[PDB]
Design a protein around this ligand. Structure first.
Ligand code: CLA
Ligand code: CLA
Ligand code: CLA
Ligand code: CLA
Ligand code: CLA
Ligand code: CLA
Ligand code: CLA
Ligand code: CLA
Ligand code: CLA
Ligand code: BCR
Ligand code: SF4
Lengths: 51, 670, 250, 51, 122, 86, 98, 51
């Protein structure tokens, strides 16, 4: 429990770090792939202006 | 009897397996529930229930196939341009498949006829209908109705047999009865029935269409009443297959009807012969192979071999009218059956392994080391020989030494037995053509054909090595001496003995699926390039031939760079430049999606489940922080499931990539 | 005797079919047929229908019964049972009815090759025709590596002559200079190089593993193997030169 | 940004759970790189920090 | 022909509808505004607000159902009346969630959930 | 050879002993649990490393721990069959 | 329940019991099989017009319980959501209002 | 190899016993192949495209 070392303080809440990193990774992947897929689908359908 | 058919178990998921009775404590329970769904052997109750489940599930699947046939028939009767295709098949692409005008999906339907826009189907159902004398919409209506009735009948039979069969039921174990009645009544007495159908409905009809009367006086002549035409009206002597029908570019249907009659006679005579024939040698096989999994494996291997024979025989032994010119249809009919052959062969290997683990094996498993060792040596020999002739040609062509490569204009490896295999076909010294399109010309086999055939042999042998190694080393091995107790499918036996990952027969199938996929991707590419380069294509009135690939195969397929450039790059221009082009937009999109899925599989293929379990625990911390506790505890996929998901996504993505690549190009060129 | 096997009506099962069942079923299972065995159904019905019992059945019940009994053709006859009882006896006795793989299958050659070797638990002593037949044994024993009475240099010389004579061909033909006016001295040089490389490998093997099966008594360990390898190099040179001389002269 | 986030996620998770995670709460007793922890306890492929 | 006429009308309607939307001086493809403008054509503020509301609604309904069904049996065999009750009740999530945040009913102290793997002991 | 260690949390299941495929583990009397017995690993030189003992151990974290040592492998720890190292 | 009048008899009295029924159907032999899906197979002693329903036994309660299974619930909701998206796309295409 | 006529009388495998690569070694070798392929496939493309 001695929260003195920096690695100690990082390890105390390591689950929070990893969970938030997973959240931001999921957000970026979802919203980049989905917008790219929107553009791909709407430009395959002869609609460049629907991107 | 039927009072025990109760819905009380519908809500109780996982009832069939006693390992799932503890309840869904973790998410692994869901995947196990889905995994054991059709594993009737390990499910609860006696062996009679196993037989009832197997037979009724067979009937239910048969009803499903009948429903699929009925759907195809209704699409052909009410959602197709089959009328104008009947009137002019050489100018209309088959289409029984529309797309709704939503999200601009209207761009997928393309001009197939002046009154029809839709997706060009390549199933070949229109050629089948024409060969089945189906002309009016009413005929397709009644075909769909009969298929729906068959669906209902088979569904009701599957429902009934779960209670008609009992603990005393034994009709499935009577293999003499099954073989005799199947053989005679189906292969003999139904082949002659189809011969009757053809003689009485095709020859009265298909010659009428070929005689130029697409009118057929409507029903005055088409609706039978044509007993003044004779059965062998236009055989034109000759030999079956030597002379094709000049109008439809196929074998005369009278010859097909005679074939079916004679094959039915042959099957009936074989059923009569089986009363006294050669036996007492396959008798150990007879007694030791009376089990569900062994007969399933035997039937899967047989059906897959028949599928590959169908794939090779549907393309340059033209049976269907107006089908040889429909190049996308020919390509699809070959390649789909090729893939099914590969998949069902792999399934045969898997169920051979399952039979070895459940039943007791035979004598060949005792000298398994020489078998699976000479198989290893032959695989290494033909891999270090077939492929490397490509590597040698590639290296020496890059070095600028074309006279030292394996080509026709260089050191040439003549296909001696194939060049002396003029036995097949044995056609006259020219080609056949219907309408600006080549029907069939003999594939002149040279050096490139020799090398690619050896590549096929090598890939087949390696896939067989994986399958037979899984089968023979299922019970035990020098590595692990109690693999029998570990079951059929297991991730490993532990990191000990250096590491025991993927020793189970299930993992051997897991690798064999990859190797079969790699085996017949080369088969697909060989067919797709060879037909375009040397068979398919336009014509010139001066007897000169302009193929689609302009004869690239004999000059480029000798090197891997030739395959990369002239097949995967130049012939991918149609699919890659397919955006906003009406017919081929979905093919470009599906090409992209297949790439995505194939790359997505690698996440499951390369990673282990412990990392994902730890990540899931890290996320579950945040969930527990906000009082969001999933009591079905989140667990990462099991090792076997991770491998299965990876393999499925890998094969699906790659198959979709090839599928789009070949279909879009053949639709554009045609 | 057994109660339910007496006075069983022919309508339930015929006499010959019942005798065939009893023959096929092992004797110990007659009293209490197991389950899912035709004899189990015969017992479960003959104890319900018979002379002193229910003498009639509904048509559908009798129809289902007739499809649970054997149809007199799915049962092994006496000769087939003998075939199995003797084939299994052969297999368990360590003898294999010799068979040879064919076009997706194997032909039985009608021969009993004794399978287990002198050490029955040894995996590599299972005797086969291609390694333990008289011809195979005498051919392996008469090889230069094994021939009795040969000095190590003689074995080396013979093996080297074979290798050197053979190795010229793959280079002088289909080689980089296969079409040059010489086209064979290049092959000679390449074959001598291959012989030298494999001889160097053999020297590495003899200086690392040091086989002692060719050393005479009281000698430096591995000396026989080293002598064999050196004379293999000499014989490879000689065979390569002889093949080249034959090619040039003839 | 997605790629950087995920790379940092994997590396940071490996660093923080190199000394022990819920799945394997003794990981600092073993080497930095080791094969696995056996098929039991759910299966433990790719469990080391090196993995 | 009629379906293509309808498609042409849709295309012309799209042309006239995107006229007020901003597009680059070199591409011609209309742009989406992500500056929080709230008052331009194609702004991302309105879709962001709508999605955040409905996503919080979904998450709040799921969390409410999980809290009110503290059992694994209720997750495989959904209590449909309670499930739809929570689904309908989720509309007030932006207020109920904040009232739980400030009143100590959403979060849980770290000393009540499994922190993670041990990193030390000796 | 690997390193198989038994910790005090053992409750005398005997499941680890039964799961071992090379008779590495054994039951010894003790007084630290209601079963009056704990596991022992007197013959870890025969421990292949399959970790079946760890799979069979029901304590919260395994009372028996197998530490893999790959730079330590002997012929017994590798399960060599075709080749003898003695 | 469904065999309130069958004169059901045990194998031990196959040829002993003859009292037919409230109908004239002869007594039926009940065989206690060990299968849970077919716990008891009933055998007849002669011609009979026995009412043996081939229809299953379902009830509203357990059909609703099956529809309350998480798969059916989360498939109905997602199917309705996808259908609503498709209908919105049909009715308000090209998001002109944005 | 231990069954081939000449090999068995020279090499019994007791010295440098052939074994399959261990798990960590296998993962590392696959990683090396993947990294080499992915990295070294690019410079040819760069040179072909720019030059
Ligand atoms: C096409 C290939 C592909 C794709 C799409 C993904 C997708 C993903 N990987 Mg992955 N991965 C791959 C190949 C791929 N991987 C390979 C080959 C490896 C080597 C083993 C890995 C190793 C790996 C690790 C080690 C990690 C990921 C993570 C992730 C996730 C990142 C978060 C995200 O963007 O979610 C968005 C989701 C998608 C884009 C999927 C589409 C969802 C539908 C279709 C929309 C995501 C699920 C990380 C993770 O779990 O993040 C939370 C993570 O820790 N991957
Ligand atoms: C089993 C094979 C099979 C397959 C793959 C399809 C596939 C399809 N059918 Mg179809 N169909 C089938 C059997 C099949 N059908 C049978 C047996 C019948 C006769 C009862 C029909 C009668 C039928 C009609 C009448 C129509 C389709 C339509 C369609 C298309 C859109 C379906 C839709 O709107 O979703 C509906 C989804 C649901 C109802 C969710 C459940 C789609 C390609 C439509 C089409 O192509 O429009 C142009 C259309 O109008 N089908
Ligand atoms: C491959 C298909 C197949 C096979 C092999 C069988 C085989 C059988 N059925 Mg069956 N059945 C089927 C499909 C099939 N059925 C379908 C699709 C239906 C729905 C119409 C039925 C409806 C049905 C009934 C209603 C009955 C049978 C019965 C039987 C048995 C005797 C019938 C006979 O002589 O033939 C036999 C085991 C009879 C039986 O069990 O005899 C006691 C019986 O009563 N079947
Ligand atoms: C005597 C009548 C008769 C007739 C007219 C035909 C006619 C035909 N048979 Mg055939 N066949 C017959 C008897 C007959 N068969 C018998 C008795 C058998 C049993 C051995 C077969 C087994 C058989 C097979 C296995 C195949 C054919 C095939 C064919 C077709 C290709 C012809 C060809 O290229 O031949 C060249 C000479 C043709 C429609 C092939 C086919 O269907 O092509 C798609 C094919 O694969 N037949
Ligand atoms: C007649 C064909 C046939 C039959 C009757 C069976 C029957 C059986 N197989 Mg089997 N198998 C077959 C063909 C067949 N197989 C083939 C061709 C292969 C090679 C791939 C296999 C490989 C195989 C393996 C490796 C295993 C079995 C197992 C089993 C048993 C349980 C299956 C189960 O519960 O799965 C439940 C059903 C599923 C999980 C289906 C899920 C869907 C699949 C996995 C993905 C398909 C994706 C789809 C095609 C694409 C989606 C479209 C996309 C656009 C979205 C059962 C006896 C298992 C067993 O334990 O046997 C005792 C087992 O381990 N089989
Ligand atoms: C790089 C190729 C190569 C290598 C490794 C060797 C290796 C060897 N050579 Mg050699 N040799 C080579 C090419 C090579 N040779 C060629 C091309 C020629 C033709 C001129 C010869 C001619 C040659 C002779 C004439 C002799 C050797 C001998 C030897 C051995 C000392 C040694 C094994 C000697 C030997 O075998 O003595 C034991 C010996 O007398 N070599
Ligand atoms: C039977 C013994 C024999 C005979 C008759 C010849 C005969 C010949 N050799 Mg020759 N040679 C021999 C052994 C022999 N060689 C051996 C053992 C070597 C290895 C050192 C060589 C290496 C050798 C070379 C390198 C060359 C000859 C050449 C020649 C020709 C001059 C002549 C045909 C020359 C020739 O004509 O080559 C075309 C030549 O260049 N020989
Ligand atoms: C009750 C449902 C619920 C709720 C309230 C949350 C809440 C949260 N999740 Mg989450 N999650 C859920 C279900 C849920 N999850 C499911 C089913 C999965 C499996 C796919 C995940 C997988 C998951 C991952 C991998 C991660 C989160 C993360 C998070 C946190 C950040 C928000 C986020 O990333 O959302 C985005 C949520 C997802 C991408 C998962 C999909 C959402 C599912 C489909 C909603 C299901 C709701 C359910 C059906 C409601 C039914 C109600 C009815 C029965 C009455 C947040 C605490 C992240 C985190 O820890 O950062 C702090 C993170 O990295 N979740
Ligand atoms: C909440 C979602 C939702 C909403 C608001 C609608 C609303 C509508 N649908 Mg629709 N539909 C939905 C989901 C939805 N549907 C789903 C999930 C499917 C499954 C594929 C369908 C399949 C469908 C078809 C096939 C048709 C409609 C039609 C219609 C319109 C007439 C009403 C009707 O036929 O009921 C729709 C019936 C159901 C939703 C019950 C499905 C069981 C109406 C605007 C019809 C139309 O366009 O009218 C001219 C029409 O032909 N829908
Ligand atoms: C194909 C065939 C086969 C095989 C065969 C073979 C294997 C062969 C081989 C062969 C060979 C492989 C031969 C060789 C020979 C050699 C020789 C003949 C040599 C000689 C040499 C010499 C003579 C030398 C001399 C010398 C010396 C020694 C040194 C010095 C110098 C001199 C030169 C003097 C079989 C049967 C399977 C079957 C079919 C047929
Ligand atoms: S399994 Fe674990 S707890 Fe049980 S006796 Fe063995 S070491 Fe002790």
């Amino acid at each position: 429990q001695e929260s003195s070392s920096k690695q100690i303080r990082i390890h105390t809440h390591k689950a929070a770090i990893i969970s938030h990193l997973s959240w931001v990774s999921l957000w970026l992947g979802f919203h980049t792939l989905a917008v790219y897929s929107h553009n791909d689908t709407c430009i395959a359908f002869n609609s460049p202006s629907k991107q | 009897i039927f009072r025990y058919i109760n819905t009380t178990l519908w809500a109780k998921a996982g009832h069939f397996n006693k390992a799932l009775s503890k309840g869904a404590k973790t998410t692994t329970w869901i995947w196990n529930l889905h995994d054991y769904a059709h594993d009737f052997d390990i499910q609860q109750r006696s062996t009679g229930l196993i037989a009832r489940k197997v037979f009724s599930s067979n009937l239910a699947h048969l009803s499903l196939v009948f429903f699929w046939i009925s759907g195809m028939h209704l699409h052909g009767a009410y959602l197709s341009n089959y009328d104008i295709w009947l009137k002019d098949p050489k100018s209309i692409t088959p289409s029984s498949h529309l797309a709704y005008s939503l999200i601009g999906q209207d761009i997928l339907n393309s001009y197939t006829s002046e009154y029809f826009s839709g997706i060009t189907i390549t199933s070949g159902f229109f050629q089948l209908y024409r060969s089945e004398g189906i002309i009016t919409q009413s005929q397709l209506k009644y075909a769909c109705a009969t298929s729906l009735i068959a669906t209902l009948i088979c569904l009701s039979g599957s429902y009934l047999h779960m209670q008609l069969m009992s603990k005393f039921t034994s009709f499935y174990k009577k293999f003499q009865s099954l073989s005799q009645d199947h053989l005679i009544i189906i292969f003999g007495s139904r082949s002659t029935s189809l011969s009757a159908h053809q003689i009485h409905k095709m020859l009265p009809a298909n010659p009428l269409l070929d005689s130029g009367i697409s009118k057929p006086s409507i029903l005055q002549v088409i609706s039978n009443s044509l007993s003044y035409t004779l059965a062998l009206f236009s055989t034109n002597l000759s030999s079956t297959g030597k002379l094709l029908n000049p109008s439809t570019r196929s074998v005369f249907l009278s010859q097909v009807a005679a074939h079916h009659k004679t094959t039915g006679v042959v099957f009936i005579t074989l059923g009569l012969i089986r009363f006294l024939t050669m036996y007492k040698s396959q008798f150990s096989i007879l007694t030791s192979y009376i089990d569900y999994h062994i007969v399933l494996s035997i039937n899967l291997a047989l059906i897959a071999s028949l599928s590959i024979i169908v794939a090779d025989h549907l393309t340059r032994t033209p049976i269907y009218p107006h089908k040889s010119t429909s190049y996308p249809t020919i390509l699809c009919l070959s390649i789909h059956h090729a893939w099914l052959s590969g998949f069902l062969i792999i399934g045969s290997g898997a169920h051979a392994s399952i039979f070895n683990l459940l039943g007791s094996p035979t004598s060949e498993i005792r000298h398994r080391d020489p078998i699976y060792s000479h198989l290893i040596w032959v695989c290494i020999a033909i891999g270090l020989h077939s492929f490397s002739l490509y590597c040698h040609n590639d290296t020496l062509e890059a070095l600028g030494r074309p006279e030292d490569i394996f080509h026709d204009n260089s050191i040439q490896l003549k296909a001696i037995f194939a060049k002396q295999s003029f036995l097949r076909a044995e056609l006259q010294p020219d080609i056949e053509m219907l309408d600006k399109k080549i029907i069939r010309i003999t594939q002149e086999l040279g050096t490139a054909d020799f090398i690619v055939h050896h590549i096929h042999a090598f890939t087949i042998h390696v896939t067989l090595l994986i399958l037979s190694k899984g089968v023979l080393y299922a019970r035990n091995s020098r590595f692990v001496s109690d693999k029998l107790e570990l079951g059929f499918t297991y991730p490993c036996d532990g990191p000990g003995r250096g590491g025991t990952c993927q020793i189970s027969p299930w993992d051997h199938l897991f690798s064999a699926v990859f190797w079969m996929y790699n085996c017949l991707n080369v088969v697909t590419f060989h067919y797709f390039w060879k037909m375009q380069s040397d068979v398919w294509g336009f014509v010139s009135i001066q007897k000169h031939i302009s193929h689609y690939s302009q004869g690239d195969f004999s000059v480029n397929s000798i090197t891997i760079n030739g395959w990369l450039r002239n097949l995967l790059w130049s012939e991918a221009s149609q699919v890659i430049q397919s955006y906003a082009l009406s017919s081929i937009c979905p093919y470009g999109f599906i090409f992209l999606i297949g790439h995505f899925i194939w790359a997505f599989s690698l996440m499951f293929l390369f990673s282990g489940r412990a990392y994902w379990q730890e990540l899931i625990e890290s996320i579950l911390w945040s969930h527990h922080k906000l009082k969001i506790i999933p009591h079905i505890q989140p667990r990462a996929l099991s090792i076997s499931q991770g491998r299965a998901v990876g393999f499925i996504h890998y094969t699906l993505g790659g198959i979709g990539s090839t599928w789009a690549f070949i279909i879009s190009r053949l639709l554009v060129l045609t | 005797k057994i109660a339910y096997l007496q006075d069983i009506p022919r309508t339930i099962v015929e006499k010959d079919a019942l005798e065939l069942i009893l023959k096929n079923t092992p004797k110990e299972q007659w009293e209490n047929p197991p389950e899912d065995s035709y004899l189990y159904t015969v017992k479960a019905f003959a104890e319900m229908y018979g002379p002193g019992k229910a003498t009639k059945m509904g048509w559908w019940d009798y129809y289902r019964l007739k499809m649970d009994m054997p149809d007199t053709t799915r049962l092994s006859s006496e000769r087939e049972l003998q075939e199995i009882e003797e084939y299994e006896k052969l297999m368990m006795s360590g003898k294999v009815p010799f068979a040879v793989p064919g076009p997706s299958g194997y032909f039985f050659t009608g021969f009993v090759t004794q399978w287990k070797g002198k050490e029955p638990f040894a995996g590599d002593q299972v005797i086969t025709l291609t390694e333990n037949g008289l011809f195979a044994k005498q051919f392996l024993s008469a090889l230069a590596f094994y021939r009795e009475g040969l000095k190590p240099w003689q074995r080396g010389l013979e093996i080297g002559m074979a290798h050197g004579y053979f190795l010229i061909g793959p280079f002088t033909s289909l080689g980089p200079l296969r079409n040059t006016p010489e086209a064979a001295t290049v092959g000679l040089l390449c074959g001598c190089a291959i012989v030298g490389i494999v001889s160097i490998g053999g020297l590495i093997f003899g200086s690392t593993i040091k086989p002692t099966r060719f050393d005479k008594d009281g000698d430096k360990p591995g000396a026989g193997f080293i002598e064999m390898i050196n004379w293999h190099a000499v014989g490879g040179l000689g065979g390569a030169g002889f093949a080249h001389a034959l090619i040039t002269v003839f | 940004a997605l790629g950087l986030h995920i790379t940092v996620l994997i590396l940071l998770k490996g660093g923080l759970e190199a000394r022990g995670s819920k799945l394997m709460p003794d990981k600092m007793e073993h080497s930095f790189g080791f094969s696995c922890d056996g098929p039991g306890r759910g299966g433990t492929c790719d469990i080391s920090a090196w993995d | 022909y009629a379906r293509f006429n309808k498609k042409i009308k849709m295309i012309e309607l799209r042309e006239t509808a995107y006229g007020d939307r901003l597009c680059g001086k070199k591409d011609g493809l209309p742009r989406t505004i992500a500056t929080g403008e709230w008052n331009v054509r194609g702004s991302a503020m309105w879709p962001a607000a709508i999605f955040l509301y409905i996503a919080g609604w979904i998450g709040w309904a799921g969390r409410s159902y999980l809290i009110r069904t503290n059992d694994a049996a209720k997750e495989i065999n959904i209590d449909v009346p309670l499930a739809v009750t929570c689904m309908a009740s989720g509309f007030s999530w932006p207020v109920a969630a904040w009232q739980e945040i400030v009143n100590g009913e959403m979060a849980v102290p770290n000393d009540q959930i499994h922190n993670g793997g041990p990193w030390n002991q000796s | 050879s690997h390193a198989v260690k038994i910790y005090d949390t053992c409750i005398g299941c005997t499941l680890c002993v039964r799961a071992c495929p090379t008779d590495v583990l054994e039951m010894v009397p003790a007084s630290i649990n209601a079963a009056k017995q704990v596991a022992s690993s007197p013959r870890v030189e025969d421990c292949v490393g399959c970790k079946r003992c760890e799979t069979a151990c029901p304590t919260d974290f395994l009372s028996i721990r197998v530490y893999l040592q790959d730079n330590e492998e002997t012929q017994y720890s590798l399960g060599l069959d075709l080749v003898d190292w003695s | 329940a469904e065999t309130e009048e069958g004169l059901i008899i045990k194998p031990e009295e196959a040829g002993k019991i003859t009292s037919r029924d409230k109908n004239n159907n002869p007594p039926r032999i009940v065989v206690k099989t060990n299968d849970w899906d077919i716990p008891e197979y009933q055998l007849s002693t002669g011609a009979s017009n026995q009412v043996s329903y081939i229809t299953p036994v379902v009830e509203s309660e357990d059909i609703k319980a099956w529809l309350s299974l998480n798969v059916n619930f989360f498939s109905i909701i997602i199917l309705f959501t996808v259908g609503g998206l498709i209908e919105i796309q049909r009715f308000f295409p090209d998001t002109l209002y944005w | 190899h231990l069954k081939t006529p000449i090999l068995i009388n020279l090499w019994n495998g007791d010295i440098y016993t052939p074994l399959a690569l261990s798990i960590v070694q296998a993962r590392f070798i696959g990683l090396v192949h993947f990294s080499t392929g992915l990295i070294l496939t690019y410079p040819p493309f760069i040179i072909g495209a720019t030059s």
